[PDB]
């Protein structure tokens, strides 16, 4: 029927003065734009059909043509930034916000989807959707006693669209918009659906990627325990945004970091530091490096949970980017730890894998390792056992590397390497 129409035929039917002929053509346009193989988006745009589709959004007496045009515009707005702009330039934004209150649920859901694609383009369109007043009617669709009474797909689109309203930086979303969304966002974070949980964590992930004032706004709502629960989930699409939000929170103040520790987050890191996914292992190591940059009683809590051997292991064998994050974790550990905490780091076997990474073809990891060695030697002086540590570095072949790092391109590497061999001779 409406299968495999030409663009010329679609134009001929939409330009007729017959609402049912226009409905037939719009459906044929929707079917073209919903094919997997190269949807002719640019061809439809050049034909001048976007303004006609936008007007069809307002024909309340013919809901089938509201739905077909919203679907067609949804898919145009899913392409490039130039194609999303054509949808916006046609006046689609206020029309989709009006459709949010449609008594037909499949039409309201389609307006949510279209507004999600518009806001996902970037900061500008995101704020423009907010200025047109989309948040109030969006949150009204979720003001029910139990979210389980809503349709699964209806709820997944609402969570996804909302997350796109929390997304992107330069600038971040308006503070008032974030404060207005968070209570509903926290409720979604306790829902049972896997996709709702994943997209809710991504939203919290975005809101925590910024200054400490943004982090505190989230922490104040008490979502940190629930983030730790999801951090130990089985589903990979949930663990990934959950860890990102935890890692974001520990970039802030020591008090905000301590709330992550109090919720039991460190108990999950034996698994996270041995996760078979390279990206989970790296982000977990990065998070550990920001935790060892805190107070001494926090470094001690890292020790108590037994995570120092896991850092030794990651330093011993992992993807090179994960290894560098582990080198940072050690240098932060050594620069802010006590004497008892620095020697315990040696008793766990940090020295050998730390020396073996001095053969890396990277200058920054060399500087980080060498500065860690300096802080370790400084603690050996305080005890008067520098001889033992220098012997330890020589026996494993670390001295050969340190002295080979003399003849290095970078000046800073040479100076630190020399200063080390002059003070302790190994």
């Amino acid at each position: 029927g409406t299968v495999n129409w030409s663009v010329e035929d679609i134009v001929k039917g939409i330009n007729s003065n017959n609402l049912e002929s226009q409905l037939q053509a719009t459906q044929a346009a929707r079917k073209l734009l919903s094919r997997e193989k190269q949807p002719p988006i640019d061809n439809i745009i050049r034909a001048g059909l976007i303004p006609k589709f936008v007007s069809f959004l307002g024909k309340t007496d013919c809901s089938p043509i509201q739905f077909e045009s919203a679907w067609a515009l949804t898919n145009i707005a899913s392409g490039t930034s130039e194609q999303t702009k054509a949808v916006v330039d046609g006046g689609a934004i206020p029309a989709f916000i009006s459709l949010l209150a449609s008594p037909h649920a499949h039409i309201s859901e389609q307006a949510v989807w279209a507004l999600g694609n518009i806001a996902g383009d970037g900061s500008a369109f995101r704020d423009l959707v907010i200025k047109h007043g989309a948040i109030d009617p969006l949150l009204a669709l979720l003001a029910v006693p139990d979210l389980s009474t809503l349709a699964c797909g209806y709820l997944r689109n609402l969570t996804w669209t909302l997350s796109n309203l929390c997304r992107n930086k330069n600038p971040a979303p308006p503070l008032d918009a974030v404060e207005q969304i968070l209570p509903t966002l926290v409720r979604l974070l306790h829902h049972n659906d896997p996709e709702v949980l994943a997209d809710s964590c991504w939203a919290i992930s975005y809101l925590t990627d910024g200054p400490n004032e943004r982090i505190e706004m989230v922490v104040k709502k008490g979502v940190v325990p629930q983030l730790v629960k999801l951090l130990g989930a089985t589903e990979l699409p949930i663990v990934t945004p959950a860890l990102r939000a935890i890692g974001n929170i520990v970039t802030g103040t020591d008090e905000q970091t301590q709330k992550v520790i109090d919720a039991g987050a460190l108990a999950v890191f034996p698994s996270l530091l041995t996760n078979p996914k390279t990206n989970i292992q790296k982000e977990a190591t990065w998070t550990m490096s920001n935790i060892t940059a805190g107070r001494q009683d926090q470094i001690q809590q890292v020790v108590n949970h037994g995570l120092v051997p896991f850092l030794v292991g990651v330093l011993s064998k992992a993807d090179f980017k994960t290894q560098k994050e582990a080198a940072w974790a050690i240098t932060n550990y050594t620069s802010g730890g006590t004497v008892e905490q620095i020697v315990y780091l040696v008793h766990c076997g940090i020295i050998e894998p730390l020396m073996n990474l001095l053969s890396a073809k990277d200058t920054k990891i060399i500087q980080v390792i060498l500065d860690a060695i300096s802080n370790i030697f400084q603690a050996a002086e305080k005890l008067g056992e520098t001889e033992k540590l220098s012997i330890m570095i020589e026996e494993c072949g670390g001295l050969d590397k340190i002295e080979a790092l003399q003849r290095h391109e970078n000046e800073s590497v040479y100076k630190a390497s020399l200063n080390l061999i002059e003070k302790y001779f190994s």
């Binding site: 679907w71 949804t74 898919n75 707005a77 392409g79 694609n117 991504w202 970039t251 920001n290 940072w328």
Partner: peptide, 13 residues
Amino acid sequence: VKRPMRPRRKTKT
């Protein structure tokens, strides 16, 4: 110091 260092669009078929 501390060191500070998912589809945007969906098509309906």
